[PDB]
Amino acid sequence: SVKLTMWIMPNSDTPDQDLLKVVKPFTDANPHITVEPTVVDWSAALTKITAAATSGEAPDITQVGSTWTAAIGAMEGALVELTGKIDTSAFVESTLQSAYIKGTDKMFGMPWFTETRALFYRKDACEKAGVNPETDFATWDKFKDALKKLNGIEVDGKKLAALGMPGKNDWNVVHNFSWWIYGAGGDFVNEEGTQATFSSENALKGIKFYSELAVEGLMDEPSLEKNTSDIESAFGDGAYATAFMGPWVISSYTKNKEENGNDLIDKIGVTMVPEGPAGRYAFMGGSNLVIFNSSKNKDEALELLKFFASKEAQVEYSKVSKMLPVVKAAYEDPYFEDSLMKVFKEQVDKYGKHYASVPGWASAEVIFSEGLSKIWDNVMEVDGAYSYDKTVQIVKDVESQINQIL
């Protein structure tokens, strides 16, 4: 029979089992097609996918970060063009921007799932600090005042940091700055996506406001030396009062309770990111699916992508992974009325903003990760006292690099 291979990026402790649970109805209905997933770590995925495209040794299908689709699709003869092959009228319209190469009419990926980053908070810590989560995180200024109340108060048998966020180089370095830049009134690029603009006065204002939360002692400075994975685990172990995280962590914390009784899942809530002077904006990300032009089973590969876009598969994928569907009909299922999941859906719908879907963006994220993390080294006073002037110089240099890539 036809043996389809596909690469997936992990966001759970059992990536392959989860995937096989979703595709079992497809293999049942199509007995002559089998699906075998192979996990590729996030840090290695961009290089591994790029090498697969240029060399011609690839699986049939791979997951791709939504923000990388245009970079891979723009590579001569790398991907099967999907424009006209997938019925996109059933998708959440906003999810389609990252499936195309901006400015062209060429679609090289299919939207698979969506995610955003929301504000997790500890209900018990807020009660002790006199913070009302419903209202006190609503704006930048209220958020900062709430962190001041939370900072260093003893909950149970430890002093909690008010906000825990990672600072080490991973792909989330830029994502975690994005909505602060947006909320300040700035953007990474011009409307056309051909010019970097995050050294504007407003972009710098958002960068300054967020990074100086750590200067002012409201962020756990030691956590800035760690990556997203470590902060997610630390929050699940009760280390912080608040953290901005994606919805998949809810699955981790639920499993922690089942496996050892860690009750952390029972004393957290989630609210939308605080509103800045520009209005409310949120990070919109997720992943798409692509078919390698080197595939010798392109017919079956397209059948499988269409399955992943089916309502039933979209609903089941969200339940197992906690990611958000990209297909409108999936939200008819009552599972999405859950008090935590509804926050993520409302936030990405009303306020979600995705990066420009341009071929150079994937390369830009490499530079963003290496460049913007130097801001956290400035805050940590590794090499000299903190200085906003140094942050400005870092951002100017990064902007010059990104302009050259674009």
Ligand SMILES: OC[C@H]1O[C@@H](O[C@H]2[C@H](O)[C@@H](O)[C@H](O)O[C@@H]2CO)[C@H](O)[C@@H](O)[C@@H]1O
């Ligand atoms: O920037 C690449 C890619 O990142 C995606 O977020 C990932 C993140 O990179 C990873 O470290 C974390 O553990 O999981 C998240 C969600 O899968 C983001 O969703 C994409 O839009 C983006 O293209």
